Ligand binder design. Structure first.
Ligand SMILES: CCCCCCCCOCCOCCOCCOCCOCCO
Ligand SMILES: CCCCCCCCOCCOCCOCCOCCOCCO
Length: 772
């Protein structure tokens, strides 16, 4: 629909950038193609496609309309075979916006190397959950998005913290708009498991080893969340929704120009959600606000400032799991899915907030520079009280552990990078060079010395959480941890022939962790990056990448000698084939990957049998582990109204003991989610369903009262979802979502501190959405 343009004649390069902006559309173009060329003037209210061909008049170019992207090209009479992955300069550094694409496959993405590339162009397993996928399945937080993310297994620590695995590993790398956060432990990390989706265009998950832009992190994967941007045309919606267990949500999103010319633009969102739950006596109020303003200092320099806020506020939180596996006499416990061991007042409230500014400049070069500044806060207030231990006892009584942890972590980040193309041996390549700095400071108080508390409860079977609240007494501890990370990085993308692209780069990294433990330091550590993409035909490419990452170890990870283990480190070896159909409306990938870990913390049984250095008392051992597996995935259009996302992932991870590790992550998993838009009489109806399956998973847990190790098994199971929306009116729709249709009763945690957690029983969600 109709847009307000003002782009005067200039370098086609600039004109294309100016365009991408005025139109909220990503423009991809070949730098060597547009180099000596100028646009014709465009002026006024126009439709973005009239507009573009008017602009290109006289330049000899053609436009390929691709949703939220347009790619420009300038055909010759000549053309000796086509260069499908030719170097392309882009107008949005974060990639193609997914909102309004109507699609479940992404557009372009910068998750891997900071270069704007397509999933076919990127030599790494890259899976995205698009904006509309999130709308259709009602994924309102990152837990739901992970649950629907191909290749990811979401398991429960407690009611207020989930765990995400990829490829054998716990993910602990998160980014916001491609700025890594610090996630060292749950101190720094408050509220990552919980981020609301109201403020995001999309979540993008790079699986493998992602040190190139994470810097220091875990193996498995990064999870990168892209914030919603403002727009040149005005628009918004209000949403209301109502679900199982008095789960009520509302959301408001408003976007547009704030001045007559549109040189300042803004977007604002607020979402509030108060829900009870199938678990007895648990509730959770979440609140979120978001504000972003964009200012154009001039057609080629943009300033952005913005803040975000989310408070996650529960009652009846638990510490670890929903109930204890064994009872006092060591039999397995059997309890309703409603069983909730947290106490009534028990709460792990976690809050997050960010203030950020960026500046982005187009060098008349075709180069573009970007400075990113961040202030983030991750805070928690955790008066936890839960039944814990081998309970009930034969007389049905039980015992509560109760501790209190309050704390806050402030981070500041500076990130600056430069991106552009360059000729080498007659051909066009591109480059990112960037540098980064983060300082984050955790401070906190723990309380464990309870004064005059009677922690017994008389009735376990009817546990209600109805126990008193203790006297926390005085702080037992002050936390003071400072982490400081400095990185510099470079990736070059070489267009060697018309079918081969070579990726060469890496990151040098400096990591210091300071405070109440002995200083942890790593200086000048190099993280290599090698990738290659070979085109086979118009449709298929093969690729291979060697990628790396390390994390200095937590400080309690010392050895026999009382020395900290060398950093937890891994390389991902990946080879695969990616296919691209229907002009990038549909994407397929099949990958084989291996992950070699070195220095993986490991108990040290022989020592810990009987410590002998008085210096340490529980030492670890730095071992090796290996992940072997493969992955297949598909996303996008199976047919005109018909959209899917699906994947199959197989893995086994072994450590040096030879034994299987991460045995709770299933060895085999599968996801398919789909919806269909009817045409003709019923073109206002959208239907959808999906399923998720995983094979066997187990834990080894020690039965203390009987003194034996037992295996606990979750037999393979399916989860089915269904979904329908009807667009009653131009401005108004009603959807229903039904989740876990066959009410499969299954487990999301067995073994975490000898406890267990059930996954959600059948739940419904109803909602209307109104678009102004
Ligand atoms: C130092 C702290 C930084 C705070 C940044 C917060 C920014 C909050 O700004 C909110 C901007 O939202 C703009 C909403 O856009 C709506 C546009 O409609 C304007 C009225 O329309 C008139 C006719 O269409
Ligand atoms: C163990 C409990 C699970 C119960 C399972 C029930 C499954 C049945 O699904 C039926 C849903 O159909 C109800 C249709 O209601 C229509 C939704 O309309 C939305 C209202 O929009 C309001 C406009 O302002």
């Amino acid at each position: 629909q109709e847009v307000e343009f003002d782009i005067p004649p200039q370098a086609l390069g600039s004109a294309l950038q100016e365009f991408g902006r005025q139109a909220d559309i990503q423009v991809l173009y070949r730098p060597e193609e547009v180099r000596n060329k100028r646009s014709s003037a465009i002026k006024g209210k126009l439709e973005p496609n009239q507009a573009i061909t008017e602009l290109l008049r006289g330049t000899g170019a053609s436009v390929d309309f691709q949703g939220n992207a347009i790619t420009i090209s300038v055909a010759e009479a000549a053309d000796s075979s086509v260069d499908l992955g030719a170097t392309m300069i882009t107008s949005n550094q974060l990639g193609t916006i997914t909102e309004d694409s109507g699609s479940y496959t992404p557009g372009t993405i910068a998750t891997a190397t900071r270069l704007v590339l397509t999933p076919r162009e990127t030599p790494q397993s890259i899976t995205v959950v698009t904006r509309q996928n999130m709308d259709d399945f009602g994924l309102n937080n990152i837990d739901d998005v992970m649950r629907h993310t191909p290749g990811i297994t979401v398991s429960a620590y407690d009611t207020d913290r989930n765990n995400y695995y990829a490829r054998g590993f716990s993910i602990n790398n998160f980014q916001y708009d491609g700025i890594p956060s610090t996630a060292r432990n749950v101190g720094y990390s408050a509220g990552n498991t919980l981020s609301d989706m109201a403020i995001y265009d999309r979540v993008e998950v790079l699986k493998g080893a992602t040190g190139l832009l994470t810097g220091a992190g875990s193996l498995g994967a990064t999870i990168n969340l892209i914030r919603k941007k403002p727009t040149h045309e005005f628009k918004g919606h209000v949403e209301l929704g109502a679900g199982s267990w008095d789960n009520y949500r509302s959301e408001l999103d408003v976007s547009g120009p704030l001045t007559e010319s549109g040189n300042v633009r803004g977007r604002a969102v607020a979402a509030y959600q108060d829900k009870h739950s199938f678990m007895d006596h648990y509730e959770r109020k979440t609140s979120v606000y978001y504000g972003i303003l964009e200012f154009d200092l001039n057609p080629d320099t943009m300033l952005t400032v913005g803040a975000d806020y989310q408070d996650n506020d529960p009652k009846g939180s638990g510490w670890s799991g929903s109930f204890p596996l064994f009872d006092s006499q060591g039999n397995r416990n059997d309890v309703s899915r409603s069983f909730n061991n947290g106490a009534k007042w028990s709460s792990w409230e976690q809050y997050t907030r960010t203030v950020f500014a960026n500046l982005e400049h187009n060098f008349a070069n075709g180069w573009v520079g970007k400075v990113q500044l961040d202030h983030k806060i991750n805070g928690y207030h955790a008066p936890l009280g839960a039944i814990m231990g081998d309970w009930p006892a034969p007389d049905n009584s039980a015992k509560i552990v109760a501790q209190k942890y309050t704390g806050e972590t402030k981070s500041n980040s500076l990130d600056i990078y430069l991106t552009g193309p360059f000729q080498f041996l007659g051909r066009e390549h591109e480059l990112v060079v960037g540098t980064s700095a983060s300082f984050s400071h955790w401070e906190g108080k723990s309380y464990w010395n309870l004064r005059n508390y009677d922690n017994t409860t008389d009735d376990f079977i009817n546990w209600d959480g109805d126990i008193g609240k203790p006297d926390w007494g005085t702080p037992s501890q002050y936390i003071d941890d400072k982490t400081r990370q400095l990185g510099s990085y470079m990736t070059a993308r070489f267009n060697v022939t018309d079918d081969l692209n070579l990726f060469l780069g890496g990151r040098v990294v400096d990591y210091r962790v300071t405070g109440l433990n002995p200083t942890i330091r790593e200086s000048g550590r190099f993280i290599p990056y090698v990738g290659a993409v070979y085109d086979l035909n118009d449709t298929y490419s093969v690729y291979a990448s060697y990628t790396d990452i390390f994390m200095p170890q937590d400080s309690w990870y010392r050895d026999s000698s009382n020395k900290l283990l060398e950093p937890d480190e891994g390389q991902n070896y990946e080879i695969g084939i990616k296919g691209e159909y229907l002009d990038g409306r549909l994407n397929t990938s099949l990958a084989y990957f291996e992950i070699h870990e070195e220095n993986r913390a490991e108990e040290d049984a022989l020592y810990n049998s009987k410590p002998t250095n008085p210096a340490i008392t529980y030492a670890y051992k730095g071992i090796k582990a290996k992940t072997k597996g493969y992955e297949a995935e598909i996303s996008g259009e199976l047919a005109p109204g018909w959209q899917v996302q699906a994947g199959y992932t197989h893995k086994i991870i072994r450590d040096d003991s030879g034994k299987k590790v991460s045995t709770w992550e299933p060895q085999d998993q599968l996801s398919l989610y789909t919806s269909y838009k009817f045409k003709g009489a019923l073109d206002k109806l959208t239907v959808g369903g999906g399923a998720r399956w995983q094979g066997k998973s187990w834990q080894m847990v020690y039965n203390n009262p009987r003194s034996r190790w037992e295996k606990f098994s979750q037999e393979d199971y399916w989860l089915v979802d269904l979904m329908a929306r009807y667009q009653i009116t131009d401005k108004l729709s009603a959807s229903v979502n039904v989740n876990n249709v066959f009410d499969k009763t299954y487990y999301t945690n067995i073994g975490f501190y000898t406890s267990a957690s059930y996954g959600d029983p059948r739940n419904l969600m109803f909602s209307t959405r109104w678009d102004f």
